[PDB]
Protein backbone atom coordinates (compact mmCIF):
# COMPACT_ATOMS: atom_id res chain seq x y z
CA UNK A 1 0.00 0.00 0.00
CA UNK A 2 2.81 1.87 0.65
CA UNK A 3 4.25 3.93 -1.91
CA UNK A 4 7.53 5.15 -3.49
CA UNK A 5 8.70 8.61 -3.02
CA UNK A 6 11.12 11.53 -3.38
CA UNK A 7 10.02 13.44 -0.44
CA UNK A 8 11.39 10.74 2.57
CA UNK A 9 9.14 8.34 4.93
CA UNK A 10 9.45 8.38 8.80
CA UNK A 11 9.26 4.85 9.12
CA UNK A 12 9.53 3.46 12.71
CA UNK A 13 10.92 0.41 12.51
CA UNK A 14 11.12 -1.80 14.94
CA UNK A 15 13.90 -4.49 14.99
CA UNK A 16 13.72 -7.70 17.12
CA UNK A 17 16.68 -9.09 18.00
CA UNK A 18 15.27 -12.62 18.62
CA UNK A 19 18.26 -15.24 20.90
CA UNK A 20 17.06 -18.61 21.59
CA UNK A 21 16.87 -17.77 25.23
CA UNK A 22 13.75 -15.65 24.58
CA UNK A 23 15.11 -12.59 25.06
CA UNK A 24 14.78 -10.67 22.64
CA UNK A 25 16.33 -7.00 22.19
CA UNK A 26 14.04 -4.65 20.94
CA UNK A 27 15.51 -1.76 18.96
CA UNK A 28 13.22 1.56 17.70
CA UNK A 29 14.74 2.79 14.72
CA UNK A 30 13.23 5.64 12.73
CA UNK A 31 14.76 6.51 9.24
CA UNK A 32 13.28 8.25 6.48
CA UNK A 33 13.51 6.40 3.07
CA UNK A 34 12.71 8.11 -0.05
CA UNK A 35 11.79 4.49 -1.83
CA UNK A 36 10.11 2.31 0.62
CA UNK A 37 11.63 -0.64 -2.04
CA UNK A 38 15.07 0.48 -0.79
CA UNK A 39 13.99 -0.42 2.58
CA UNK A 40 12.82 -3.19 1.60
CA UNK A 41 15.62 -4.46 0.24
CA UNK A 42 17.76 -3.06 3.22
CA UNK A 43 15.93 -5.36 5.66
CA UNK A 44 15.15 -7.94 3.36
CA UNK A 45 16.51 -10.78 5.49
CA UNK A 46 14.84 -9.78 8.46
CA UNK A 47 11.67 -11.30 9.23
CA UNK A 48 8.59 -8.92 8.39
CA UNK A 49 6.66 -9.67 11.16
CA UNK A 50 3.86 -6.43 10.18
CA UNK A 51 4.02 -3.02 8.63
CA UNK A 52 1.69 -0.43 9.05
CA UNK A 53 1.82 3.10 6.76
CA UNK A 54 4.59 4.60 9.24
CA UNK A 55 5.50 1.78 11.29
CA UNK A 56 7.35 -1.43 10.16
CA UNK A 57 8.42 -4.40 12.64
CA UNK A 58 11.63 -6.63 11.56
CA UNK A 59 12.89 -9.75 13.03
CA UNK A 60 16.27 -10.45 13.17
CA UNK A 61 17.16 -13.63 15.14
CA UNK A 62 20.32 -15.48 15.78
CA UNK A 63 21.91 -18.34 17.15
CA UNK A 64 22.77 -17.12 20.13
CA UNK A 65 21.48 -16.80 23.62
CA UNK A 66 22.23 -12.90 24.08
CA UNK A 67 25.41 -11.58 25.92
CA UNK A 68 23.03 -11.38 28.75
CA UNK A 69 21.87 -14.28 28.71
CA UNK A 70 25.50 -16.00 29.58
CA UNK A 71 25.58 -13.66 32.63
CA UNK A 72 21.74 -15.14 33.35
CA UNK A 73 21.20 -18.25 32.06
CA UNK A 74 18.20 -19.05 34.03
CA UNK A 75 15.52 -21.39 32.55
CA UNK A 76 12.60 -21.67 34.35
CA UNK A 77 9.71 -23.66 34.65
CA UNK A 78 6.50 -22.67 35.96
CA UNK A 79 4.28 -25.49 37.40
CA UNK A 80 2.61 -25.98 34.52
CA UNK A 81 5.54 -26.71 32.71
CA UNK A 82 6.00 -23.76 31.22
CA UNK A 83 9.52 -23.82 29.52
CA UNK A 84 10.39 -19.92 30.09
CA UNK A 85 13.69 -18.12 30.72
CA UNK A 86 13.49 -15.65 33.28
CA UNK A 87 15.53 -13.01 34.97
CA UNK A 88 17.05 -15.13 38.55
CA UNK A 89 14.84 -17.77 40.43
CA UNK A 90 11.98 -18.18 38.35
CA UNK A 91 9.31 -16.61 40.43
CA UNK A 92 6.34 -14.51 40.40
CA UNK A 93 8.26 -11.76 41.66
CA UNK A 94 10.33 -11.39 38.28
CA UNK A 95 9.10 -11.20 35.33
CA UNK A 96 8.43 -14.46 32.36
CA UNK A 97 10.63 -13.16 29.39
CA UNK A 98 8.29 -15.10 27.26
CA UNK A 99 6.66 -17.92 27.06
CA UNK A 100 7.49 -20.83 24.91
CA UNK A 101 5.96 -24.12 26.07
CA UNK A 102 4.02 -26.01 28.53
CA UNK A 103 4.97 -29.95 29.83
CA UNK A 104 3.97 -32.16 32.59
CA UNK A 105 6.53 -32.09 35.15
CA UNK A 106 4.67 -35.17 36.80
CA UNK A 107 6.12 -36.63 33.21
CA UNK A 108 9.65 -34.90 33.92
CA UNK A 109 12.36 -36.73 35.39
CA UNK A 110 12.19 -35.48 38.86
CA UNK A 111 15.38 -33.71 39.41
CA UNK A 112 14.94 -32.48 36.07
CA UNK A 113 11.81 -30.44 37.41
CA UNK A 114 13.37 -28.98 40.54
CA UNK A 115 15.92 -27.16 38.43
CA UNK A 116 13.96 -25.67 36.49
CA UNK A 117 11.97 -24.84 39.15
CA UNK A 118 14.63 -22.56 41.09
CA UNK A 119 16.55 -22.14 37.51
CA UNK A 120 19.46 -23.15 36.21
CA UNK A 121 22.32 -20.84 37.37
CA UNK A 122 24.37 -20.83 34.01
CA UNK A 123 23.30 -21.86 30.20
CA UNK A 124 25.67 -21.61 27.31
CA UNK A 125 23.99 -21.98 23.60
CA UNK A 126 24.33 -25.69 23.02
CA UNK A 127 23.49 -26.35 26.71
CA UNK A 128 20.14 -24.10 26.29
CA UNK A 129 19.09 -25.69 23.35
CA UNK A 130 19.87 -29.43 24.88
CA UNK A 131 17.53 -28.58 27.94
CA UNK A 132 15.20 -27.51 25.52
CA UNK A 133 15.06 -30.74 23.06
CA UNK A 134 14.54 -32.28 26.40
CA UNK A 135 11.44 -30.04 27.57
CA UNK A 136 9.96 -30.41 23.89
CA UNK A 137 11.32 -34.50 24.20
CA UNK A 138 7.91 -34.73 26.99
CA UNK A 139 5.91 -31.74 25.38
CA UNK A 140 2.75 -32.54 27.46
Not at 32 to 44: H, I, L, P, Q, T
Not at 108 to 121: A, F
Amino acid sequence: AEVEHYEPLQVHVQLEKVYLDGDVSIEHKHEKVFSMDDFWAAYAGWTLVEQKKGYVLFRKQMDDISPLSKVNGYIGVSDNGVISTFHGRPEPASEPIQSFFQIDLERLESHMQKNLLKGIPFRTKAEFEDVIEHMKTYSG
